[PDB]
């Protein structure tokens, strides 16, 4: 099944934040309405916050997360959770090798803001 794709409320501000846990340099791309809106990269085995940004979901609300390491796409896992029917997390993990810890780049999207 498709992973790392989330339908947000239209025209809504959301945070996106990426963490790295790998010897391989991570590249995180964030797409809104199928257009790249943010790119993060870094290299850490200690959960460095390699990027964080506020984006707007635009008229379609479609947000996609993609992860690659030195050109090769990572396998992704994802889900969305809603607390008290108001607070949203879109969660992404990724695997760039063979140990299957799926923490190599971790991405959290949260909304609403403000």
């Amino acid at each position: 099944a498709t992973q790392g794709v989330f339908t947000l409320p239209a025209n809504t501000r959301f945070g996106v934040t990426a963490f790295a846990n790998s010897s391989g340099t991570q590249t995180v791309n964030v797409l809104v309405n199928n257009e790249t809106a943010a790119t993060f990269s870094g290299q850490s085995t200690n959960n460095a916050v390699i990027g964080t940004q506020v984006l707007n979901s635009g008229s379609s609300g479609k947000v996609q997360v993609q992860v690659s390491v030195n050109g090769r796409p990572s396998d992704l896992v994802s889900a969305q959770v809603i607390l008290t029917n108001e607070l949203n997390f879109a969660l992404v993990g990724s695997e760039d090798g063979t140990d299957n810890d799926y923490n190599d780049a971790v991405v959290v999207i949260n909304w609403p803001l403000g």
């Binding site: 790998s22 010897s23 391989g24 340099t25 290299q43 030195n70």
Partner: peptide, 8 residues
Amino acid sequence: KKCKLCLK
């Protein structure tokens, strides 16, 4: 890389 040292 003949020496197994292609490193990340």
